[PDB]
Design a protein around this ligand. Structure first.
Ligand code: HEM
Ligand SMILES: COc1ccc(O)c(OC)c1
Length: 137
């Protein structure tokens, strides 16, 4: 289930962070307006850059902390606030997060593996809700 998924993901965190961020960017090419220094690069080109692995691994680490602190796939309001208030997330809206979670769930459903994809879908929706409540447009 969800808790075991966090353990699976943490077990190979950089690899998964890469696979999932790429799934996101490839599903929603307009989303790359937020990531101007990854424009014009194929998946393997991105993976070859130490900065890409480093960024994706730090993002996924916080994502897993938030997931692990959630109750019944409902994240803490304080963690939502953190994500809203981060300087890095200034211009974002909840739709940016919705899209990330749609890509993440799709990635899980297509993997050979027993992820609890329905739990991740409900976590994404609840995270979107919490972001809105914490002041994201
Ligand atoms: C639960 C979801 C997310 C988490 C946990 C998260 C976490 C983080 C973290 C930890 C960083 C800093 C990474 C570092 O410099 O070490 C970061 C940067 C950033 N995040 Fe997020 N983020 C999330 C979702 C999003 C989404 C949905 C977007 C846009 C679609 C976004 C856009 C950015 C951007 C633009 C940066 C700065 C990029 C850079 O300077 O290299 N994030 N995020
Ligand atoms: C793991 O998923 C990731 C990794 C890096 C990102 O910048 C991101 O933003 C949408 C998601």
């Amino acid at each position: 289930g969800f808790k075991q998924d966090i353990a699976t993901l943490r077990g190979d965190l950089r690899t998964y962070a890469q696979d999932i961020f790429l799934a996101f960017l490839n599903k929603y090419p307009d989303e790359k307006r937020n990531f101007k220094n990854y424009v014009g690069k194929s998946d393997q080109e991105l993976k070859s850059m130490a900065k890409f692995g480093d960024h994706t691994e730090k993002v996924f680490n916080l994502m897993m902390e938030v997931a692990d602190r959630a109750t019944d796939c409902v994240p803490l309001a304080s963690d939502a606030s953190t994500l809203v208030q981060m300087k890095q997330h200034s211009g974002l809206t909840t739709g940016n997060f919705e899209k990330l979670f749609v890509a993440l769930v799709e990635y899980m459903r297509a993997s050979g593996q027993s992820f609890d994809s329905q739990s991740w879908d409900r976590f994404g929706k609840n995270l979107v809700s919490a972001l809105s409540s914490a002041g994201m447009k």
